[PDB]
Amino acid sequence: VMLPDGTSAYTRDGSFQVDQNGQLVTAGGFQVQPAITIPANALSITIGRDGVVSVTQQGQAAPVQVGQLNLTTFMNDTGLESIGENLYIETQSSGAPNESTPGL
Amino acid sequence: MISSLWIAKTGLDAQQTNMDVIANNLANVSTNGFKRQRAVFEDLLYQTIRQVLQIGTGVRPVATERLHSQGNLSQTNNSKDVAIKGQGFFQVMLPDGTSAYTRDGSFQVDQNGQLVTAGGFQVQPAITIPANALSITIGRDGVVSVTQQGQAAPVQVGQLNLTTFMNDTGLESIGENLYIETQSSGAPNESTPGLNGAGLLYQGYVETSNVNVAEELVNMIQVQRAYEINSKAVSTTDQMLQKLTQL
Amino acid sequence: MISSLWIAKTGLDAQQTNMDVIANNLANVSTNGFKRQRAVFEDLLYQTIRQVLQIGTGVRPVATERLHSQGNLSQTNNSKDVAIKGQGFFQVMLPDGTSAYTRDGSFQVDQNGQLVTAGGFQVQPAITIPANALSITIGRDGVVSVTQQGQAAPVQVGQLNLTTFMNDTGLESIGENLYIETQSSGAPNESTPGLNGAGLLYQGYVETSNVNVAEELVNMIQVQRAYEINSKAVSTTDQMLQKLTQL
Amino acid sequence: MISSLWIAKTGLDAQQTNMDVIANNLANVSTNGFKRQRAVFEDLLYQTIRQVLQIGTGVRPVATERLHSQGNLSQTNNSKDVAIKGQGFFQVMLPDGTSAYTRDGSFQVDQNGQLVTAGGFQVQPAITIPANALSITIGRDGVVSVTQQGQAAPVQVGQLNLTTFMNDTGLESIGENLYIETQSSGAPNESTPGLNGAGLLYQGYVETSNVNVAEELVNMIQVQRAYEINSKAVSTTDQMLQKLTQL
């Protein structure tokens, strides 16, 4: 997820929101990486298991993939440090990041 | 919790309304020209979370739906009794000036010699009833061809047409087997009796209710049983409630 | 600790959701053409530490899974009642212009003489209903071969086909026993009734719910019992908690 | 601390007031022309600290809200019993000179031959009751067209109109199913019965309460259960209190 200063962030979170301007954020306004615009006519939110934000909009009877998300892996998560409200960023001992496809 | 609460609530009121519907649908035998109603249980919107992970809501009765069928009829043999073979509805004036519609076989005279029905409800169109009119030989299509004293002729003292509509479910019983034109009732058309869906005049007879009882007695029994099964569901819900408020 | 906490939590919500599922699955009797749902308890990923030293997680209900079976049916004997022997779904227009699908036996006329259902929901394809159409002799495959007044012929005033799909689990009840095509619903095909999985028109009748109650009453009893056993597990957990916070 | 104290307090008094509301709403069966009340739980102002970091307050019942629906009615067959089909309220004089409103089917005569109700509460407008008035043939719109001894005519010995208002929730029961005009009651209008929302006179009958019991019995059970759950919340609060005053 993107910190509002432009830097990235890492977590294990289950609470995400929308801003005023219809983007996908989390934790009360912390944007995701990659960013996803949230419409208003998107009635159901059918999320795929690997980032497929396949929502169904009003008048659109289809799981419209309005976003794709990958999962970042590292090499030594002991180097990752909690940087405020269960967030993490890449440090020296954290390992190398790799936003691979979820499930592998 | 609240889920089982509202689910038991809507099953309770659905079965209660079904019980009241069949209860009012069994007591209306010998109601003249009557068409009986019945509720239809139907769901509500379901709530899908993921492509299929749904929630599901609704057992609701939508409305009581009429059954426009000619019921039983009796051979009464009176000139003030007229049934209608088939369809076609009567047209009578309410005393406030408005019209009315029915399937009636009981019409009277007032003090002032007009043709009324149901104890003073005038017909449409109005007919004046004399006293020397000995026999009442009614034509099949409204020809009130009575024979007066000293007048050996079927003197047509009135002509009547039958009003037809487009959706009689929209017609509503407005008090003592009367009907008036509503929005969903259809467009009125007082066509000649015998055509455009209108029947003919059967002088001597009445129409009555289309109430089948033993089928709806089975419906009464099964709605009582489902009411008790909803009560069993409430009992299990409250047993979990009391065992968990023990916890 | 947190282990027993979340385990008691997921057993609690699994049994609660099961109770709500069977509770909503008992109140939906006399819902027309209805196919009932049921949840399936399933685990999650286990967590092996060494080749076999595992952890084990999950008791989760996945989703409520429909049972597409023809339930009970009643002999109603009305021309506005049509059941379907076997399979094949209706196709009716929602008033916003979209389509709808059902297994319905209750259709009406509007004010303006079109064929609608459920209190003003037009059919697909649309059919205009006259007033002089005396008898309604419906063919088995959509042939609305009514006979009008002065027209001694089964005048086909409408033709109807039946829509078939590929996975009716994807179809979702969208309000008062209606369905629309979804992603997992399959591809629609309004084939001729009587072929390609489509049934025929049984004029006079309705379909209803496939709700078996006494089996699901045993399911209600055992889900109440397992809810109480999960409550016993919570009681033992909190007894250890209070005896250890005494320690 | 004080947070859980007041929260448990307002949940306690909300559930207590709900219990008293449904308790008084179950004992009022056979109250004539009665419209039943119910409370509505509603929050208070929330307290946001930062754009969203709120506090949140309120579970309050606002007020008991009436349900102006025609309940059950009984066929009593007495000339001193008059029901009203539909709406429209009576107008009777309180003995201090003020007016009153009701839906009553029980009226009497005093010692001095006036028309009163409920054991001496005069009507509006007042009607003198003779002794030679043998039959009481009441018109549907206030026409007290009785027939006196030696007078073979429906002598109209009184005319009555029906008072309508604008918001009957503002009307308050002022003692033994009476009502008077309040601020929120609306503007009175004693229009002719049968028009402007007024019904007609059904001589022989009474109106009664719109009390549905089994639904409100489920409401009694669930309010008792939520009262016990609020008691469980108080128990956990005081357990933390005693374990921390141990600390």
Coordinates of N, CA and C in Angstrom, one line a residue, chain C residues 11-137:
Chain C
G11 N -16.5 -21.9 15.0 CA -17.5 -22.8 15.3 C -18.8 -22.1 15.6
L12 N -18.8 -21.0 16.4 CA -19.9 -20.3 16.7 C -20.6 -19.7 15.5
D13 N -19.8 -19.0 14.6 CA -20.5 -18.4 13.5 C -20.8 -19.5 12.4
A14 N -20.2 -20.6 12.4 CA -20.6 -21.7 11.5 C -21.9 -22.2 11.9
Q15 N -22.1 -22.5 13.2 CA -23.3 -23.0 13.7 C -24.4 -22.0 13.7
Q16 N -24.1 -20.7 13.9 CA -25.1 -19.6 13.8 C -25.6 -19.5 12.3
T17 N -24.6 -19.5 11.4 CA -25.0 -19.4 10.0 C -25.8 -20.6 9.5
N18 N -25.5 -21.8 10.0 CA -26.2 -23.0 9.7 C -27.6 -22.9 10.3
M19 N -27.8 -22.3 11.5 CA -29.1 -22.1 12.1 C -29.9 -21.1 11.3
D20 N -29.3 -20.0 10.8 CA -30.0 -19.1 10.0 C -30.3 -19.6 8.6
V21 N -29.5 -20.5 8.1 CA -29.7 -21.1 6.8 C -30.9 -22.0 6.8
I22 N -31.0 -22.9 7.8 CA -32.1 -23.8 7.9 C -33.4 -23.1 8.4
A23 N -33.2 -22.0 9.2 CA -34.3 -21.2 9.6 C -35.0 -20.5 8.4
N24 N -34.2 -20.0 7.5 CA -34.7 -19.4 6.3 C -35.2 -20.5 5.3
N25 N -34.6 -21.7 5.5 CA -35.0 -22.8 4.6 C -36.2 -23.5 5.1
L26 N -36.8 -23.2 6.3 CA -38.1 -23.8 6.7 C -39.2 -22.9 6.5
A27 N -39.0 -21.5 6.4 CA -40.1 -20.6 6.3 C -40.5 -20.4 4.8
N28 N -39.8 -20.9 3.8 CA -40.1 -20.7 2.4 C -40.9 -21.8 1.8
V29 N -41.8 -22.4 2.5 CA -42.7 -23.3 1.9 C -43.8 -22.4 1.2
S30 N -44.4 -23.0 0.2 CA -45.4 -22.4 -0.7 C -44.8 -21.2 -1.5
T31 N -43.4 -21.1 -1.6 CA -42.8 -20.2 -2.6 C -42.7 -20.9 -3.9
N32 N -43.2 -20.3 -5.0 CA -43.4 -20.9 -6.2 C -42.1 -21.2 -7.0
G33 N -42.0 -22.4 -7.4 CA -40.8 -22.8 -8.2 C -39.5 -22.7 -7.5
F34 N -39.5 -22.9 -6.2 CA -38.3 -22.5 -5.4 C -37.4 -23.7 -5.2
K35 N -36.1 -23.3 -5.2 CA -35.0 -24.3 -5.0 C -34.2 -23.8 -3.8
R36 N -34.1 -24.7 -2.8 CA -33.6 -24.4 -1.5 C -32.1 -24.5 -1.4
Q37 N -31.5 -23.7 -0.5 CA -30.0 -23.7 -0.3 C -29.6 -24.3 1.0
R38 N -28.3 -24.6 1.1 CA -27.7 -25.2 2.2 C -26.2 -24.9 2.2
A39 N -25.7 -24.7 3.4 CA -24.2 -24.4 3.6 C -23.4 -25.7 3.7
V40 N -22.1 -25.6 3.4 CA -21.3 -26.8 3.4 C -20.0 -26.4 4.3
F41 N -19.9 -27.1 5.4 CA -18.7 -26.9 6.3 C -17.5 -27.5 5.7
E42 N -16.4 -26.6 5.6 CA -15.2 -27.0 5.0 C -14.0 -26.4 5.7
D43 N -12.9 -27.1 5.6 CA -11.7 -26.6 6.4 C -11.0 -25.4 5.7
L44 N -9.8 -25.1 6.2 CA -8.9 -24.2 5.6 C -7.6 -24.9 5.4
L45 N -6.5 -24.1 5.0 CA -5.2 -24.6 4.9 C -4.7 -25.2 6.2
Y46 N -4.0 -26.3 6.2 CA -3.4 -26.8 7.4 C -2.0 -26.3 7.4
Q47 N -1.3 -26.5 8.5 CA 0.1 -25.8 8.6 C 1.0 -26.9 9.1
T48 N 1.7 -27.6 8.2 CA 2.7 -28.6 8.5 C 4.0 -28.0 8.9
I49 N 4.5 -28.4 10.0 CA 5.9 -28.0 10.5 C 7.0 -28.9 10.1
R50 N 6.7 -30.2 10.1 CA 7.6 -31.3 9.8 C 6.9 -32.5 9.3
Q51 N 7.6 -33.2 8.4 CA 7.1 -34.4 7.7 C 6.9 -35.5 8.7
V52 N 4.1 -36.7 10.6 CA 3.5 -35.5 10.0 C 3.1 -34.5 11.1
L53 N 3.7 -33.4 11.3 CA 3.4 -32.4 12.4 C 2.7 -31.2 11.7
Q54 N 1.4 -31.2 11.8 CA 0.6 -30.2 11.2 C -0.1 -29.4 12.3
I55 N -0.7 -28.3 11.9 CA -1.5 -27.5 12.8 C -3.0 -27.7 12.5
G56 N -3.5 -27.4 11.3 CA -4.9 -27.5 11.0 C -5.7 -26.3 11.4
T57 N -6.4 -25.8 10.3 CA -7.3 -24.7 10.5 C -8.5 -24.9 9.7
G58 N -9.7 -24.3 10.1 CA -10.9 -24.2 9.3 C -12.0 -25.2 9.6
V59 N -13.2 -24.6 9.8 CA -14.4 -25.4 9.9 C -15.5 -24.7 9.0
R60 N -15.0 -23.8 8.1 CA -15.8 -22.8 7.5 C -17.0 -23.3 6.6
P61 N -18.2 -22.7 6.7 CA -19.1 -22.9 5.7 C -18.7 -22.1 4.4
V62 N -18.7 -22.7 3.3 CA -18.2 -22.0 2.1 C -19.3 -21.1 1.6
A63 N -20.5 -21.5 1.3 CA -21.6 -20.8 0.7 C -22.8 -21.6 0.9
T64 N -24.0 -21.0 0.7 CA -25.3 -21.7 0.7 C -25.4 -22.2 -0.8
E65 N -25.6 -23.5 -0.9 CA -25.6 -24.2 -2.2 C -27.1 -24.7 -2.5
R66 N -27.6 -24.2 -3.7 CA -28.9 -24.5 -4.0 C -29.2 -25.9 -4.4
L67 N -30.4 -26.4 -4.3 CA -30.9 -27.7 -4.7 C -32.0 -27.6 -5.7
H68 N -31.6 -27.7 -7.0 CA -32.5 -27.4 -8.1 C -33.3 -28.7 -8.4
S69 N -34.4 -28.9 -7.6 CA -35.3 -30.0 -7.7 C -36.7 -29.5 -7.7
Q70 N -37.5 -30.1 -8.5 CA -39.0 -29.7 -8.6 C -39.6 -30.2 -7.3
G71 N -40.2 -29.2 -6.6 CA -40.9 -29.5 -5.3 C -42.3 -30.0 -5.5
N72 N -43.1 -29.6 -4.6 CA -44.5 -30.0 -4.6 C -45.2 -29.0 -5.6
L73 N -46.4 -29.5 -6.1 CA -47.2 -28.7 -7.1 C -48.6 -28.9 -6.8
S74 N -49.5 -27.9 -7.1 CA -50.9 -28.0 -6.8 C -51.7 -27.8 -8.0
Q75 N -52.9 -28.4 -8.0 CA -53.9 -28.4 -9.1 C -54.8 -27.2 -8.8
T76 N -54.6 -26.1 -9.5 CA -55.3 -24.9 -9.2 C -56.4 -24.6 -10.3
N77 N -56.2 -25.1 -11.5 CA -57.2 -25.0 -12.6 C -57.6 -23.6 -12.9
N78 N -56.6 -22.7 -13.3 CA -56.9 -21.4 -13.8 C -56.0 -21.1 -15.0
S79 N -56.6 -20.4 -16.0 CA -55.9 -20.2 -17.2 C -54.7 -19.2 -17.0
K80 N -54.7 -18.4 -15.9 CA -53.6 -17.6 -15.5 C -52.6 -18.4 -14.6
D81 N -52.8 -19.7 -14.5 CA -51.8 -20.5 -13.8 C -51.2 -21.5 -14.8
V82 N -49.9 -21.5 -15.0 CA -49.2 -22.4 -15.8 C -48.0 -22.9 -15.1
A83 N -47.9 -24.2 -14.9 CA -46.7 -24.9 -14.4 C -45.9 -25.4 -15.6
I84 N -44.7 -25.9 -15.3 CA -43.8 -26.5 -16.2 C -43.4 -27.8 -15.7
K85 N -43.8 -28.9 -16.5 CA -43.4 -30.2 -16.2 C -41.9 -30.4 -16.6
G86 N -41.1 -30.7 -15.6 CA -39.6 -30.8 -15.8 C -39.0 -29.5 -15.6
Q87 N -38.1 -29.1 -16.6 CA -37.3 -27.9 -16.5 C -37.6 -26.9 -17.6
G88 N -36.8 -25.9 -17.7 CA -37.1 -24.8 -18.6 C -37.7 -23.6 -17.8
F89 N -37.1 -22.4 -17.9 CA -37.5 -21.3 -17.1 C -38.2 -20.2 -18.0
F90 N -39.1 -19.5 -17.3 CA -39.8 -18.4 -17.9 C -38.9 -17.2 -18.3
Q91 N -39.4 -16.3 -19.1 CA -38.7 -15.1 -19.4 C -39.7 -13.9 -19.4
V92 N -39.5 -13.0 -18.5 CA -40.4 -11.9 -18.3 C -39.6 -10.6 -18.2
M93 N -40.2 -9.5 -18.7 CA -39.5 -8.2 -18.7 C -39.8 -7.5 -17.4
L94 N -38.7 -7.0 -16.7 CA -38.8 -6.1 -15.7 C -39.1 -4.7 -16.2
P95 N -39.8 -3.9 -15.4 CA -40.3 -2.6 -16.0 C -39.2 -1.6 -16.2
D96 N -38.0 -1.8 -15.8 CA -36.9 -1.0 -16.2 C -36.3 -1.4 -17.5
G97 N -36.9 -2.4 -18.2 CA -36.4 -2.8 -19.5 C -35.6 -4.1 -19.4
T98 N -35.1 -4.5 -18.3 CA -34.3 -5.7 -18.2 C -35.2 -7.0 -18.2
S99 N -34.6 -8.1 -18.4 CA -35.3 -9.4 -18.4 C -35.4 -9.9 -17.0
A100 N -36.1 -11.0 -16.9 CA -36.2 -11.8 -15.6 C -36.6 -13.2 -16.0
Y101 N -36.3 -14.1 -15.0 CA -36.5 -15.5 -15.1 C -37.2 -16.0 -13.9
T102 N -38.0 -17.0 -14.0 CA -38.8 -17.5 -12.8 C -39.3 -18.9 -13.2
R103 N -40.1 -19.5 -12.2 CA -41.0 -20.6 -12.4 C -42.3 -20.2 -11.7
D104 N -43.1 -19.5 -12.5 CA -44.3 -18.8 -11.9 C -45.5 -19.4 -12.5
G105 N -46.6 -19.3 -11.7 CA -47.9 -19.7 -12.2 C -49.0 -18.7 -11.9
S106 N -48.7 -17.4 -12.0 CA -49.6 -16.3 -11.6 C -49.3 -15.1 -12.5
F107 N -50.2 -14.9 -13.5 CA -50.0 -13.9 -14.5 C -51.3 -13.1 -14.7
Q108 N -51.1 -11.8 -15.0 CA -52.3 -10.9 -15.0 C -52.3 -10.0 -16.3
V109 N -53.3 -9.1 -16.3 CA -53.4 -8.1 -17.4 C -53.2 -6.8 -16.7
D110 N -52.7 -5.8 -17.4 CA -52.6 -4.5 -16.9 C -53.9 -3.7 -17.2
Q111 N -53.8 -2.4 -17.0 CA -54.9 -1.5 -17.4 C -55.0 -1.4 -19.0
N112 N -53.8 -1.4 -19.6 CA -53.7 -1.2 -21.1 C -53.7 -2.5 -21.9
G113 N -54.2 -3.6 -21.3 CA -54.4 -4.8 -22.0 C -53.2 -5.6 -22.4
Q114 N -52.0 -5.4 -21.8 CA -50.9 -6.2 -22.1 C -50.9 -7.4 -21.1
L115 N -50.1 -8.4 -21.5 CA -49.9 -9.5 -20.6 C -48.7 -9.2 -19.6
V116 N -49.0 -9.2 -18.3 CA -48.0 -9.0 -17.3 C -48.0 -10.2 -16.3
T117 N -47.2 -10.1 -15.3 CA -47.3 -11.1 -14.2 C -47.0 -10.4 -12.9
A118 N -47.4 -11.0 -11.8 CA -47.0 -10.6 -10.4 C -47.5 -9.2 -10.1
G119 N -48.6 -8.8 -10.7 CA -49.0 -7.4 -10.5 C -48.2 -6.4 -11.3
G120 N -48.3 -6.6 -12.6 CA -47.6 -5.7 -13.5 C -46.1 -5.9 -13.7
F121 N -45.8 -7.1 -14.3 CA -44.4 -7.3 -14.8 C -44.6 -8.0 -16.1
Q122 N -44.2 -7.3 -17.2 CA -44.6 -7.8 -18.5 C -43.8 -9.0 -18.9
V123 N -44.4 -9.8 -19.8 CA -43.8 -11.1 -20.3 C -42.8 -10.8 -21.4
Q124 N -42.0 -11.8 -21.7 CA -41.0 -11.7 -22.8 C -41.2 -13.0 -23.7
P125 N -41.7 -12.9 -24.9 CA -42.2 -11.6 -25.6 C -43.6 -11.2 -25.2
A126 N -43.8 -9.9 -25.3 CA -45.0 -9.3 -24.8 C -46.3 -9.7 -25.7
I127 N -47.4 -9.8 -25.0 CA -48.6 -10.3 -25.6 C -49.8 -9.3 -25.1
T128 N -50.5 -8.8 -26.1 CA -51.7 -8.0 -25.8 C -52.9 -8.8 -25.6
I129 N -53.6 -8.5 -24.5 CA -54.7 -9.3 -24.0 C -56.0 -8.6 -24.4
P130 N -56.9 -9.1 -25.3 CA -58.1 -8.5 -25.6 C -59.2 -8.7 -24.5
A131 N -60.3 -8.1 -24.8 CA -61.5 -8.3 -23.9 C -62.5 -9.3 -24.4
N132 N -62.6 -9.5 -25.7 CA -63.6 -10.4 -26.3 C -63.0 -11.8 -26.3
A133 N -61.7 -12.0 -25.9 CA -61.1 -13.4 -25.9 C -61.8 -14.1 -24.7
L134 N -62.7 -15.0 -25.1 CA -63.6 -15.7 -24.1 C -62.8 -16.8 -23.4
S135 N -62.4 -17.8 -24.1 CA -61.6 -18.9 -23.6 C -60.1 -18.7 -23.8
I136 N -59.3 -19.2 -22.9 CA -57.9 -19.1 -23.0 C -57.4 -20.5 -23.2
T137 N -57.2 -21.0 -24.4 CA -56.7 -22.4 -24.6 C -55.2 -22.2 -25.0

